[PDB]
Design an enzyme around this catalytic site. Structure first.
Site, PDB file in Angstrom:
ATOM      1  N   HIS A  41      -9.763  -5.874   4.454  1.00  0.00           N
ATOM      2  CA  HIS A  41     -10.169  -6.175   3.055  1.00  0.00           C
ATOM      3  C   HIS A  41      -9.439  -7.407   2.482  1.00  0.00           C
ATOM      4  O   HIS A  41      -9.840  -7.865   1.387  1.00  0.00           O
ATOM      5  CB  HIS A  41     -10.046  -4.951   2.167  1.00  0.00           C
ATOM      6  CG  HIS A  41      -8.657  -4.490   1.854  1.00  0.00           C
ATOM      7  ND1 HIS A  41      -8.104  -3.372   2.457  1.00  0.00           N
ATOM      8  CD2 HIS A  41      -7.769  -4.891   0.909  1.00  0.00           C
ATOM      9  CE1 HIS A  41      -6.897  -3.161   1.955  1.00  0.00           C
ATOM     10  NE2 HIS A  41      -6.673  -4.095   1.015  1.00  0.00           N
ATOM     11  N   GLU A  72     -10.126  -1.139   9.883  1.00  0.00           N
ATOM     12  CA  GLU A  72      -9.453  -1.802   8.725  1.00  0.00           C
ATOM     13  C   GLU A  72      -8.301  -2.713   9.165  1.00  0.00           C
ATOM     14  O   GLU A  72      -7.509  -3.118   8.298  1.00  0.00           O
ATOM     15  CB  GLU A  72      -8.984  -0.762   7.702  1.00  0.00           C
ATOM     16  CG  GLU A  72      -8.666  -1.358   6.330  1.00  0.00           C
ATOM     17  CD  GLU A  72      -9.782  -2.143   5.662  1.00  0.00           C
ATOM     18  OE1 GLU A  72     -10.975  -1.957   6.056  1.00  0.00           O
ATOM     19  OE2 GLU A  72      -9.460  -2.986   4.777  1.00  0.00           O
ATOM     20  N   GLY A 146      -0.690  -3.756  -4.286  1.00  0.00           N
ATOM     21  CA  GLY A 146       0.391  -4.688  -3.905  1.00  0.00           C
ATOM     22  C   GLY A 146       1.137  -4.253  -2.649  1.00  0.00           C
ATOM     23  O   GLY A 146       1.848  -5.094  -2.077  1.00  0.00           O
ATOM     24  N   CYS A 148      -0.489  -2.992   0.087  1.00  0.00           N
ATOM     25  CA  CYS A 148      -1.400  -3.100   1.264  1.00  0.00           C
ATOM     26  C   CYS A 148      -0.840  -4.175   2.211  1.00  0.00           C
ATOM     27  O   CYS A 148      -0.317  -5.216   1.725  1.00  0.00           O
ATOM     28  CB  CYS A 148      -2.863  -3.294   0.872  1.00  0.00           C
ATOM     29  SG  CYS A 148      -3.626  -1.765   0.259  1.00  0.00           S
TER      30      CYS A 148
END
Ligand SMILES: CCOC(=O)c1cn[nH]c1
Length: 182
Positions: A41, A72, A146, A148
């Site tokens: 992402h 991911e 913040g 991730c």
């Protein structure tokens, strides 16, 4: 404060950079040579900022399992003038549960941050922001925006990167040795 935090600190000091994309600032784990990982992402492009240096992306691959399900994890090869310490021998070979994990973050917003998250569950399937995702680890800490890309470690193992949360639990994507064979 103890051997958990000691391993975590050693990984942060030598194997992390601050990556900036158009989607924000992320903790980015360097794995070996010029190869690093970041949550998918982050939407990595042709150019990325690495510690505020404009950097060409030589290759980027959003990983999916053999069911063609999102994992991911994006693997990035950076046009950087310096190699990372090779940490592939700290990566687990198989999907597993863990005790006593630390989540470590380093950004402009959260510098030198270490969170003892405790027991880590092999959760498996998660609908992550609407996207069916596999190989998810879960821990019972209220993680925030913040964090991730934050690195999840145990003593002697680098097991995942933080990819989301629901306000009560946090979720990481597994790192496996097989992702980084060359
Ligand atoms: C600065 C205060 O930090 C927190 O309370 C926190 C960080 N992540 N989850 C909770």
């Amino acid at each position: 404060m103890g051997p958990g935090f000691d391993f975590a600190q050693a990984i942060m000091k030598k194997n992390t950079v601050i990556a900036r994309t158009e989607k924000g600032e992320f903790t980015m784990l360097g794995v070996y040579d010029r190869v690093a990982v970041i949550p998918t992402h982050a939407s990595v492009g042709e150019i990325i900022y690495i510690n505020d240096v404009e950097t060409r992306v030589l290759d980027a691959c959003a990983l999916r399992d053999l069911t063609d399900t999102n994992l991911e994890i994006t693997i990035v090869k950076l046009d950087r003038n310096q190699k990372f310490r090779d940490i592939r021998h700290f990566l687990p070979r198989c999907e597993d549960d863990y005790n006593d994990a630390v989540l470590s973050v380093h950004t402009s917003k959260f510098p030198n941050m270490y969170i003892p998250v405790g027991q880590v569950t092999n959760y498996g399937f998660l609908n992550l922001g609407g996207t069916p995702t596999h190989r998810i680890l879960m821990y019972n800490f209220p993680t925030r925006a913040g964090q991730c890309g934050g690195v999840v470690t145990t003593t002697g193992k680098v097991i995942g990167i933080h990819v989301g949360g629901n306000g009560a639990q946090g979720f990481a994507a597994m790192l496996l040795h097989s992702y980084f064979t060359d």
